[PDB]
Amino acid sequence: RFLKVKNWETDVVLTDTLHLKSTLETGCTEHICMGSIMLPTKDQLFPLAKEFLDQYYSSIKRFGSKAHMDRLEEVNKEIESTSTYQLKDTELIYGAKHAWRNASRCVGRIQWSKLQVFDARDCTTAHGMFNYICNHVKYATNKGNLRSAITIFPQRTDGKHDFRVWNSQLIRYAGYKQPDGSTLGDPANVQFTEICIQQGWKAPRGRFDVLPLLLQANGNDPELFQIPPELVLEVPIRHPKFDWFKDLGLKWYGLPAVSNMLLEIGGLEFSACPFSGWYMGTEIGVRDYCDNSRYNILEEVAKKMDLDMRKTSSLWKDQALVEINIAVLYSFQSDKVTIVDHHSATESFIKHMENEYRCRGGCPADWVWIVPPMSGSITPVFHQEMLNYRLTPSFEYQPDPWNTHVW
Amino acid sequence: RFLKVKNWETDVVLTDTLHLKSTLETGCTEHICMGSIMLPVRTKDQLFPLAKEFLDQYYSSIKRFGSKAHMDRLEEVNKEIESTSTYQLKDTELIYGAKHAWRNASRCVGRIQWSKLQVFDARDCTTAHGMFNYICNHVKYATNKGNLRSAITIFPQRTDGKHDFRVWNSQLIRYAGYKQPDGSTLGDPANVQFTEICIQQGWKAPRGRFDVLPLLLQANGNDPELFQIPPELVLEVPIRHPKFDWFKDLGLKWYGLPAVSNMLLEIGGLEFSACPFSGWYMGTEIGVRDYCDNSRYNILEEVAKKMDLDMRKTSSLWKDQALVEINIAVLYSFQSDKVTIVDHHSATESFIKHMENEYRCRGGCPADWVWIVPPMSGSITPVFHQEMLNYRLTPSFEYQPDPWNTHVWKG
Numbered sequence: 001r002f003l004k005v006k007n008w009e010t011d012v013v014l015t016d017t018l019h020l021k022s023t024l025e026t027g028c029t030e031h032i033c034m035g036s037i038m039l040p041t042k043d044q045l046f047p048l049a050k051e052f053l054d055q056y057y058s059s060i061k062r063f064g065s066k067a068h069m070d071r072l073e074e075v076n077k078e079i080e081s082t083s084t085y086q087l088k089d090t091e092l093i094y095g096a097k098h099a100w101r102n103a104s105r106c107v108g109r110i111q112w113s114k115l116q117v118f119d120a121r122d123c124t125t126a127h128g129m130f131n132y133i134c135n136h137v138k139y140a141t142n143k144g145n146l147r148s149a150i151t152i153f154p155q156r157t158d159g160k161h162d163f164r165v166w167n168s169q170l171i172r173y174a175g176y177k178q179p180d181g182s183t184l185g186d187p188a189n190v191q192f193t194e195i196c197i198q199q200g201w202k203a204p205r206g207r208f209d210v211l212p213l214l215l216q217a218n219g220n221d222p223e224l225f226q227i228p229p230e231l232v233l234e235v236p237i238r239h240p241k242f243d244w245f246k247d248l249g250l251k252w253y254g255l256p257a258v259s260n261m262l263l264e265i266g267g268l269e270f271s272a273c274p275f276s277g278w279y280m281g282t283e284i285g286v287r288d289y290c291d292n293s294r295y296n297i298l299e300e301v302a303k304k305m306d307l308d309m310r311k312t313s314s315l316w317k318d319q320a321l322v323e324i325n326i327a328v329l330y331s332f333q334s335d336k337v338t339i340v341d342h343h344s345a346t347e348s349f350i351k352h353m354e355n356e357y358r359c360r361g362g363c364p365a366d367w368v369w370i371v372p373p374m375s376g377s378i379t380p381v382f383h384q385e386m387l388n389y390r391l392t393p394s395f396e397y398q399p400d401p402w403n404t405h406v407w
Numbered sequence: 408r409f410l411k412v413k414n415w416e417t418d419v420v421l422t423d424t425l426h427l428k429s430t431l432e433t434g435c436t437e438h439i440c441m442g443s444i445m446l447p448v449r450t451k452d453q454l455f456p457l458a459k460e461f462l463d464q465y466y467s468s469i470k471r472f473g474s475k476a477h478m479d480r481l482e483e484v485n486k487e488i489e490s491t492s493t494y495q496l497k498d499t500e501l502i503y504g505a506k507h508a509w510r511n512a513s514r515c516v517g518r519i520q521w522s523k524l525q526v527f528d529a530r531d532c533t534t535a536h537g538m539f540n541y542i543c544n545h546v547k548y549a550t551n552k553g554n555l556r557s558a559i560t561i562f563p564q565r566t567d568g569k570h571d572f573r574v575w576n577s578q579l580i581r582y583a584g585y586k587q588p589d590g591s592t593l594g595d596p597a598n599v600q601f602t603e604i605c606i607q608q609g610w611k612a613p614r615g616r617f618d619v620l621p622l623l624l625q626a627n628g629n630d631p632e633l634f635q636i637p638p639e640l641v642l643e644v645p646i647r648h649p650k651f652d653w654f655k656d657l658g659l660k661w662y663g664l665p666a667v668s669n670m671l672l673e674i675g676g677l678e679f680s681a682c683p684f685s686g687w688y689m690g691t692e693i694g695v696r697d698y699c700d701n702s703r704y705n706i707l708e709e710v711a712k713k714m715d716l717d718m719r720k721t722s723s724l725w726k727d728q729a730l731v732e733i734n735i736a737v738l739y740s741f742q743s744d745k746v747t748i749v750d751h752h753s754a755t756e757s758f759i760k761h762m763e764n765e766y767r768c769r770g771g772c773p774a775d776w777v778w779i780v781p782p783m784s785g786s787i788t789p790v791f792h793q794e795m796l797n798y799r800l801t802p803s804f805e806y807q808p809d810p811w812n813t814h815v816w817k818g
């Protein structure tokens with residue numbers, strides 16, 4: 001019930017107690033482990049509200065103070081009366097930072113406390129949402145010196161008035177199914193690209209077309225908007241040894257910004273909460289570029305490198321993978337856009353885990369996601385045992401809005 | 408209840424009913440997942456249910472379920488248990504049993520091969536010399552001059568837990584490790600403790616970087632004894648690279664037969680505490696883990712210096728570059744010397760075909776993702792994109808404590 005995690009490379013043992021706060025469920029049982037599965041009223045509200053306010057007042061060392069009790073009473077009255085409640089700004093910021101803190105799939109959490117929070121709970125229209133988003137994009141990009149931020153739109157009410165950003169990220173490239181049977185651009189986004197097209201977006205039909213924003217305020221039909229191109233920092237992909245690399249015509253965007261998740265603070269649901277930090281190199285170089293169902297470029301790169309593609313045992317895929325990833329890192333660095341390599345990031349995350357064990361009594365962590373998708377065992381996180389469990393405040397998945405929305 | 412797993416590259420969705428037969432516990436609850444934790448005498452009482460269930464499975468597999476032959480076996484095992492407190496497996500049931508423990512091994516990527524396993528029955532063995540003899544035959548049969556064949560050798564089962572058969576070595580063939588006075592290690596650091604026990608026990612150590620350890624063998628609960636495997640029986644492969652001629656000069660080699668000797672085989676409640684098994688290597692076991700773990704041979708820096716890579720910053724991916732070259736070298740060397748080896752692309756693809764087949768014919772395939780995904784190039788192997796259900800079936804291979812931790816010394 002008090003649990004140990006061993007690092008097998010260093011022999012460091014940490015004891016976890018934080019897990020006994022865990023509220024939500026895992027998907028696992030005594031009989032079956034689901035560790036590798038991607039997707040495992042008033043009466044409900046006050047327990048959640050109290051639990052949250054309890055940890056908040058404890059975090060500022062006012063647990064059991066009149067001010068703590070007072071607020072608990074105030075929120076309680078508000079629920080009884082209104083059937084919801086409003087977070088004070090301080091609680092909103094704390095809620096947000098802690099949802100990041102608690103994200104067991106995020107390797108980048110050593111940074112969790114420095115999050116910039118933009119309160120957009122006063123927003124009412126998709127145009128308003130567009131303005132808030134552009135401000136977020138500009139603030140976060142910061143000419144390439146990227147800064148973490150989240151923008152928080154109004155919370156769910158009756159569920160027929162949801163704020164949603166339909167995009168999966170604020171900045172992503174379009175995907176077009178072609179007569180040839182194949183795909184141009186990013187195949188991950190073919191469906192959303194079609195929803196933009198049927199909405200009225202004139203598509204340049206290129207390999208790297210920045211998608212429009214499809215923004216939904218107060219449960220209305222969503223509206224198209226183009227992000228000013230001056231706000232979208234992009235990096236041309238070259239290699240520091242291979243001259244021909246640039247001829248592949250590869251680029252990526254500097255700002256990863258997740259816009260389809262749901263933020264839960266003290267029972268309150270924020271269905272539009274775009275957040276952004278910066279890239280770990282492998283996301284682009286391993287996953288975006290090399291996934292068979294993404295840009296899938298390994299074949300082409302291997303050719304240009306003139307490697308023996310006749311047998312899998314030459315490790316030509318492996319060779320090409322490394323080079324592609326050297327180039328991503330090299331390009332971002334050359335252009336002065338913040339990026340982290342998988343070595344540095346996993347080293348940080350070990351140091352973060354340590355702090356959290358010492359300061360919090362633990363750190364929920366999902367090994368399957370935390371281990372980078374290349375060179376697993378030569379990064380320290382591979383050798384590190386991790387306990388995975390669900391703490392609130394949290395980010396959660398929610399269905400793609402077009403399966404839900406009533407037009 | 409039906410459980411679905413999805414492959415996110417192909418959208419193939421499979422359905423699992425086999426987890427329904429899962430008895431043992433995972434280490435997880437509804438509130439915690441322990442999916443990355445490395446390690447998460449029986450009385451008459453619990454023995455007969457374990458026996459029955461196993462014999463029910465065995466007789467189902469041979470399409471004799473509910474037969475006269477089935478019923479009589481059940482009754483005979485039952486009589487034998489309560490009379491003697493244990494029971495003896497028939498040859499056919501032992502064979503079926505060992506094969507299933509491999510089939511059920513959720514951490515094993517090489518399971519496509521499960522039905523071709525040579526079972527050697529060493530239950531008539533009584534002494535350490537007898538064990539040495541069975542193990543040589545095993546090593547020679549499995550080696551097969553480089554055309555590796557899977558085999559397991561099964562020594563007598565546990566009785567009162569005071570007469571255990573054990574192989575003290577963790578693999579039959581493995582290199583010594585020697586902690587030096589300056590705090591450095593010579594040879595394989597994973598094997599320092601076992602190496603010191605061998606020295607204590609009287610092994611005169613050559614003290615090089617690649618000394619094949621002697622066998623330390625425990626028969627019948629007696630103090631273990633030392634034996635050297637005939638060198639002519641130990642197939643080894645010098646490691647060279649197909650383009651970098653200085654690679655050979657690093658002085659690396661590895662042995663060709665990987666043979667695990669420290670696990671416990673459980674069949675119908677019976678515990679076989681010495682059951683060495685062998686197959687062949689996936690290249691990354693040597694190239695990634697044995698060569699490049701910081702706590703093992705740790706050659707990344709020396710390799711990368713020799714390749715004159717930029718070592719001043721990790722974002723040069725010097726480590727990742729060196730790692731690929733080492734792994735090419737490992738596979739090239741084995742293939743050139745005609746020693747069976749499999750690369751991680753080829754073995755993960757076979758595993759996915761194995762797994763789909765297992766779903767269709769068997770109704771499932773317990774698989775531990777943390778273990779199945781290779782320790783380099785994860786997402787360019789199809790297993791990374793495969794969802795897996797992990798659960799424990801019997802027969803099974805289990806961990807057991809190192810014998811020096813439990814053994815009662817006689818003198």
Ligand code: HEM
Pocket residue numbers: 100103105106107108109111115148149150261275276277278279280283340345369395
């Ligand atoms: C500061 C730089 C950051 C780095 C380098 C970083 C790194 C990562 C990486 C590599 C993933 C895996 C993504 C994937 O494979 O799809 C991830 C997942 C996640 N990150 Fe972080 N992160 C950072 C900042 C943040 C911030 C600011 C938040 C929220 C405020 C956050 C919340 C999450 C969540 C919720 C997931 C899981 C997404 C999912 O389950 O689909 N990240 N992060």
Ligand code: HEM
Pocket residue numbers: 505508509512514515516517518520524557558559684685686687688689692749754804
């Ligand atoms: C045919 C050749 C084989 C290949 C290429 C293969 C591949 C592997 C690999 C790569 C591992 C992970 C080892 C590690 O990281 O420590 C493994 C684990 C395992 N394999 Fe297989 N294997 C093969 C044959 C067999 C045989 C014949 C058995 C037993 C009959 C077996 C049972 C297991 C077990 C019990 C584990 C888990 C070890 C542990 O949990 O510590 N393997 N196998």
Ligand SMILES: CCN(CCc1ccc(NC(=N)c2cccs2)cc1)Cc1cccc(NC(=N)c2cccs2)c1
Pocket residue numbers: 038108168256257258260261275276277278279280283415
């Ligand atoms: C919610 C989407 N996440 C990725 C979220 C994400 C988080 C982090 C990053 N990278 C970053 N560096 C940051 C982004 C924001 C701050 S840091 C990028 C993306 C991927 C995901 C998770 C679970 C399931 C799926 N499902 C799917 N792949 C599909 C849906 C439909 C067809 S396939 C995708």
Ligand SMILES: CCN(CCc1ccc(NC(=N)c2cccs2)cc1)Cc1cccc(NC(=N)c2cccs2)c1
Pocket residue numbers: 008445446517665666667669670684685686687688689692
């Ligand atoms: C029981 C030993 N296994 C390795 C077993 C193994 C299985 C398979 C192979 N490789 C093969 N290809 C085959 C061997 C036999 C048939 S196939 C090699 C080894 C490793 C292990 C498992 C669980 C805990 C530990 N604990 C440990 N002591 C450590 C691990 C790392 C640093 S210390 C070790």
Ligand SMILES: C[C@H](O)[C@H](O)[C@H]1CNc2nc(N)[nH]c(=O)c2N1
Pocket residue numbers: 035036037038368369370415791792793794795
């Ligand atoms: C099936 C498996 O759960 C799935 O492919 C996971 C594995 N690990 C991952 N890890 C990260 N960081 N991101 C991912 O999308 C995935 N996908």
Ligand SMILES: C[C@H](O)[C@H](O)[C@H]1CNc2nc(N)[nH]c(=O)c2N1
Pocket residue numbers: 008382383384385386443444445777778779
């Ligand atoms: C902590 C973690 O579970 C541990 O390092 C595991 C990870 N995956 C592994 N996978 C395999 N095949 N072999 C291993 O030794 C390990 N080690």
Ligand SMILES: [Br-]
Pocket residue numbers: 107108109110111340344345348
């Ligand atoms: Br980071």
Ligand SMILES: [Br-]
Pocket residue numbers: 516517519520749754757
């Ligand atoms: Br195989």
Ligand SMILES: [Zn+2]
Pocket residue numbers: 028029032033034035435439440441442
């Ligand atoms: Zn689990």
